[PDB]
């Protein structure tokens, strides 16, 4: 009843094509706040980037890449106010960039 959604994290750059993914429930509507929590978890455990490191970064975002070719960029240092939910099975991949 779960699926993997691939993700990548850019902090200072790697020379690798890392095949990492996050576990989500299949075909479930979720919020951008839910995704933000999962992004924060992998930032900490994979890269040692804590919430305080995000507070002290000049810019940070994650981007949801949809299967239809469109994207939504979420600013990790700003509030999330949309009520829109998105379906996990419509998501192709998630990218994260922290400065
Ligand atoms: Na990278
Ligand atoms: Na913003």
Curated annotation (Swiss-Prot):
Coiled coil: none annotated. MAP repeats lie at residues 3-99. It comes from the Bacteria. This is Protein map. The lineage of its organism: Bacteria, Bacillati, Bacillota, Bacilli, Bacillales. The gene is map. The chain holds residues 49 to 145 of 476 of the full protein.
